[PDB]
Amino acid sequence: PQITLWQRPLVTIKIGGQLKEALLDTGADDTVLEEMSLPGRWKPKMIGGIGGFIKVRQYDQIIIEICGHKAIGTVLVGPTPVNIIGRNLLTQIGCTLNF
Amino acid sequence: PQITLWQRPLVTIKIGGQLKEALLDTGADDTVLEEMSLPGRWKPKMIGGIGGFIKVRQYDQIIIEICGHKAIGTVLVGPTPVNIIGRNLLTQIGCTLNF
Numbered sequence A, B: 001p002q003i004t005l006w007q008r009p010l011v012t013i014k015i016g017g018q019l020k021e022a023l024l025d026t027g028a029d030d031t032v033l034e035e036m037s038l039p040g041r042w043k044p045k046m047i048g049g050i051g052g053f054i055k056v057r058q059y060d061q062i063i064i065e066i067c068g069h070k071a072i073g074t075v076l077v078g079p080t081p082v083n084i085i086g087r088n089l090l091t092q093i094g095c096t097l098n099f
């Protein structure tokens, strides 16, 4: 679909048997989600942003459905203020910037 | 032009007689530039991100040329790690997200 940018570009994801809202972010290399119940094993890691660096928990291989398309990748669950889908999953569903 | 997202979507801006590179960011409401030489007057303000909140200086009315299109808005100069062009200028040159 074409999304214009007069409002925050928010979308619905299914991940974990659970539904949430995420912001399509073209200036995020990683997908960071606020604290949620996910199973398996994971590594510690650290992500940078504006005003900070946070400690997050790295999960690989996840089932993420983003606006009905499926994808599989690395999801970092940690203390973000908003769910962020970043450039590792965005390429997988084909999003592009055009102006 | 169509930008695909396998690399960070970076573009050239002319602001202040000076040339720089900025990331087109759909998850940033405000345009935040790292510290640069701009004239006039401005207010203190504070912006949030991942990992924190920062104090920035707010200028209104600026001449920003982003990839050959012109635009005029509020630019926040402060301690970002990278130059961010946000949703207030991005609508003015027409960018859209499509997938």
Ligand SMILES: COC(=O)[C@@H](NC(=O)[C@@H](NC(=O)CC[C@H](O)[C@H](Cc1ccccc1)NC(=O)[C@H](C)NC(=O)[C@H](C)N)C(C)C)C(C)C
Residues within 6 Å of the ligand: A025, A027, A028, A029, A030, A032, A046, A047, A048, A049, A050, A081, A082, A084, A086, B025, B027, B028, B029, B030, B032, B047, B048, B049, B050, B081, B082, B084, B086
């Ligand atoms: C190792 O990876 C690094 O740590 C690199 N980081 C990145 O690429 C990271 N991207 C980023 O860090 C880029 C910034 C994001 O796109 C955030 C998203 C946000 C909006 C609202 C609330 C909270 C967050 N926007 C903002 O911080 C903007 C300036 N803030 C605002 O618009 C506020 C809410 N009014 C991602 C990990 C998220 C860094 C070198 C650029």
